[PDB]
Design an enzyme around this catalytic site. Structure first.
Site, PDB file in Angstrom:
ATOM      1  CG  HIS A  47       6.284  -2.554  -2.843  1.00  0.00           C
ATOM      2  ND1 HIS A  47       5.267  -0.927  -3.934  1.00  0.00           N
ATOM      3  CD2 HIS A  47       5.797  -2.571  -2.210  1.00  0.00           C
ATOM      4  CE1 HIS A  47       4.611  -0.982  -2.792  1.00  0.00           C
ATOM      5  NE2 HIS A  47       4.736  -2.169  -2.269  1.00  0.00           N
ATOM      6  CG  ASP A  65       6.462  -0.658  -7.040  1.00  0.00           C
ATOM      7  OD1 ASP A  65       6.551  -1.379  -7.370  1.00  0.00           O
ATOM      8  OD2 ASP A  65       5.941   0.284  -5.812  1.00  0.00           O
ATOM      9  N   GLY A 117      -0.117  -2.315   3.405  1.00  0.00           N
ATOM     10  CA  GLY A 117      -0.445  -3.827   3.210  1.00  0.00           C
ATOM     11  C   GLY A 117      -2.347  -2.879   1.827  1.00  0.00           C
ATOM     12  CB  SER A 144       0.685  -1.676  -2.531  1.00  0.00           C
ATOM     13  OG  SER A 144       1.450  -2.836  -1.786  1.00  0.00           O
TER      14      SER A 144
HETATM   15  C1  LIG Z   1      11.720  -4.171  -3.984  1.00  0.00           C
HETATM   16  O1  LIG Z   1      11.665  -4.118  -5.787  1.00  0.00           O
HETATM   17  C2  LIG Z   1      11.258  -2.886  -6.057  1.00  0.00           C
HETATM   18  C3  LIG Z   1      10.944  -1.863  -7.373  1.00  0.00           C
HETATM   19  C4  LIG Z   1       9.684  -0.757  -6.760  1.00  0.00           C
HETATM   20  C5  LIG Z   1       9.704  -0.048  -5.230  1.00  0.00           C
HETATM   21  N1  LIG Z   1       9.081   1.479  -5.807  1.00  0.00           N
HETATM   22  C6  LIG Z   1       8.917   1.731  -4.317  1.00  0.00           C
HETATM   23  C7  LIG Z   1       7.533   3.327  -4.311  1.00  0.00           C
HETATM   24  C8  LIG Z   1       8.812   1.191  -2.999  1.00  0.00           C
HETATM   25  O2  LIG Z   1       8.467   1.559  -1.892  1.00  0.00           O
HETATM   26  C9  LIG Z   1       8.438   0.630  -0.360  1.00  0.00           C
HETATM   27  C10 LIG Z   1       7.242  -0.145  -0.590  1.00  0.00           C
HETATM   28  C11 LIG Z   1       6.760   0.492  -0.515  1.00  0.00           C
HETATM   29  C12 LIG Z   1       4.737   0.833   0.221  1.00  0.00           C
HETATM   30  O3  LIG Z   1       5.588   0.547   1.394  1.00  0.00           O
HETATM   31  N2  LIG Z   1       3.768   0.973  -0.314  1.00  0.00           N
HETATM   32  C13 LIG Z   1       2.120   0.876   0.626  1.00  0.00           C
HETATM   33  C14 LIG Z   1       2.267  -0.382   1.254  1.00  0.00           C
HETATM   34  O4  LIG Z   1       1.387  -0.840   1.593  1.00  0.00           O
HETATM   35  N3  LIG Z   1       3.266  -1.038   0.801  1.00  0.00           N
HETATM   36  S1  LIG Z   1       2.680  -2.988   0.633  1.00  0.00           S
HETATM   37  O5  LIG Z   1       0.993  -3.415   1.163  1.00  0.00           O
HETATM   38  O6  LIG Z   1       2.530  -3.018   2.831  1.00  0.00           O
HETATM   39  C15 LIG Z   1       3.769  -4.455   0.337  1.00  0.00           C
HETATM   40  C16 LIG Z   1       5.084  -3.844   0.802  1.00  0.00           C
HETATM   41  C17 LIG Z   1       3.308  -5.483  -0.774  1.00  0.00           C
HETATM   42  C18 LIG Z   1       3.533  -5.747   0.571  1.00  0.00           C
HETATM   43  C19 LIG Z   1       0.740   1.757   0.356  1.00  0.00           C
HETATM   44  C20 LIG Z   1       1.986   1.953   1.529  1.00  0.00           C
HETATM   45  C21 LIG Z   1       1.599   2.190   2.911  1.00  0.00           C
HETATM   46  C22 LIG Z   1       1.974   2.679   3.899  1.00  0.00           C
HETATM   47  C23 LIG Z   1       3.512   3.225   3.904  1.00  0.00           C
HETATM   48  C24 LIG Z   1       4.267   2.624   5.257  1.00  0.00           C
HETATM   49  C25 LIG Z   1       5.727   3.353   5.259  1.00  0.00           C
HETATM   50  C26 LIG Z   1       6.443   2.634   3.834  1.00  0.00           C
HETATM   51  C27 LIG Z   1       6.577   4.517   3.042  1.00  0.00           C
HETATM   52  C28 LIG Z   1       7.780   3.928   1.793  1.00  0.00           C
HETATM   53  N4  LIG Z   1       7.305   6.050   1.227  1.00  0.00           N
HETATM   54  C29 LIG Z   1       7.878   6.120  -0.784  1.00  0.00           C
HETATM   55  O7  LIG Z   1       8.440   5.123  -0.861  1.00  0.00           O
HETATM   56  O8  LIG Z   1       7.476   6.953  -0.617  1.00  0.00           O
HETATM   57  C30 LIG Z   1       8.247   7.730  -2.113  1.00  0.00           C
HETATM   58  C31 LIG Z   1       7.567   8.772  -2.190  1.00  0.00           C
HETATM   59  F1  LIG Z   1       7.322   9.922  -1.326  1.00  0.00           F
HETATM   60  F2  LIG Z   1       5.964   8.831  -2.457  1.00  0.00           F
HETATM   61  F3  LIG Z   1       8.189   9.138  -3.178  1.00  0.00           F
HETATM   62  C32 LIG Z   1       8.240   6.528  -3.097  1.00  0.00           C
HETATM   63  C33 LIG Z   1       9.352   6.563  -3.616  1.00  0.00           C
HETATM   64  C34 LIG Z   1       9.698   7.430  -2.487  1.00  0.00           C
HETATM   65  C35 LIG Z   1       6.628   3.170   1.350  1.00  0.00           C
HETATM   66  O9  LIG Z   1       5.354   4.002   0.386  1.00  0.00           O
HETATM   67  N5  LIG Z   1       7.133   2.343   0.597  1.00  0.00           N
HETATM   68  C36 LIG Z   1       8.152   2.044   0.676  1.00  0.00           C
HETATM   69  N6  LIG Z   1       9.443  -0.513  -2.879  1.00  0.00           N
HETATM   70  C37 LIG Z   1       9.756  -0.456  -4.404  1.00  0.00           C
HETATM   71  C38 LIG Z   1      10.479  -2.192  -4.008  1.00  0.00           C
END
Ligand SMILES: COc1ccc2nc(C)c(O[C@@H]3C[C@H]4C(=O)N[C@]5(C(=O)NS(=O)(=O)C6(C)CC6)C[C@H]5/C=C\CCCCC[C@H](NC(=O)OC5(C(F)(F)F)CCC5)C(=O)N4C3)nc2c1
Ligand SMILES: [Zn+2]
Length: 188
Positions: free
Chosen positions: A68, A92, A148, A150
């Protein structure tokens, strides 16, 4: 365009520290060429596309990150854009061969309950393990603090890799989801 290393995080004994090596202008141009001559160091790379910044963690000779963040993109290197070795969207998870100069973390065999998330700032956040792919934060944090980060590592007390940070559970973050080092090895 290519993923670009813009900085890194180094683990020193029981500490982590960050360094910036590239800004937005250099990131945009290197993403276009895919050609990067900066020396690589550290276990955790700070990476960026044209539009998102996140982390990448070296484990078992592979530089791993989240789909992602990276999509299917190559990563810029001294010899040009490098294609992904591993892509699993269901997990992912993407990975490229680790750059010369990065150091691979050791997969954890501690079974510890105390885990430590390294954030993109080298902040070490405590986490309580709840199985193999989830962790409960000791103090809830606004999700802003975790964005930021992940693709960064959860470490055990000894400093081994337990998993790659994937997502956060929130409504303020209460818990985090990570890909276990075991799943990386299966992918490999
Ligand atoms: C496009 O093709 C794809 C294929 C597979 C895929 N798989 C996942 C799980 C996904 O989810 C997105 C991005 C993740 C993210 O934000 N990742 C963090 C992050 O930092 N990203 S990042 O570095 O900023 C960035 C975007 C790279 C620049 C680490 C977090 C930190 C803060 C969260 C802020 C609010 C968000 C809360 C959310 N919650 C959640 O989804 O919880 C679940 C759970 F409940 F845990 F099961 C997972 C499924 C539901 C969350 O974390 N994301 C939303 N998009 C995809 C897309
Ligand atoms: Zn361990």
């Amino acid at each position: 365009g290519s993923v670009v290393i813009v900085g890194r995080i180094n683990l020193s004994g029981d500490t982590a520290y960050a360094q910036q090596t590239r800004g937005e202008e250099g990131c945009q141009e290197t993403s276009q060429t895919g050609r990067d001559k900066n020396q690589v160091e550290g276990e955790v790379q700070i990476v960026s596309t044209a539009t998102q910044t996140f982390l990448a963690t070296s484990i078992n000779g592979v530089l791993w990150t989240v789909y992602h963040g990276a999509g299917t993109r190559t990563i810029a290197s001294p010899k040009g854009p490098v294609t992904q070795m591993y892509t699993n969207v269901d997990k992912d998870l993407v990975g490229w061969q680790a750059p010369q100069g990065s150091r691979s973390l050791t997969p954890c065999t501690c079974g510890s309950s105390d885990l430590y998330l390294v954030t993109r700032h080298a902040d070490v956040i405590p986490v309580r393990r709840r199985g193999d792919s989830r962790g409960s934060l000791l103090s809830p944090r606004p999700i802003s603090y975790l964005k930021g980060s992940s693709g960064g590592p959860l470490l055990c007390p000894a400093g081994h890799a337990v998993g790659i940070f994937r997502a956060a559970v929130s409504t303020v973050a209460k818990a985090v989801a990570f890909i276990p080092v075991e799943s990386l090895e299966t992918t490999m």
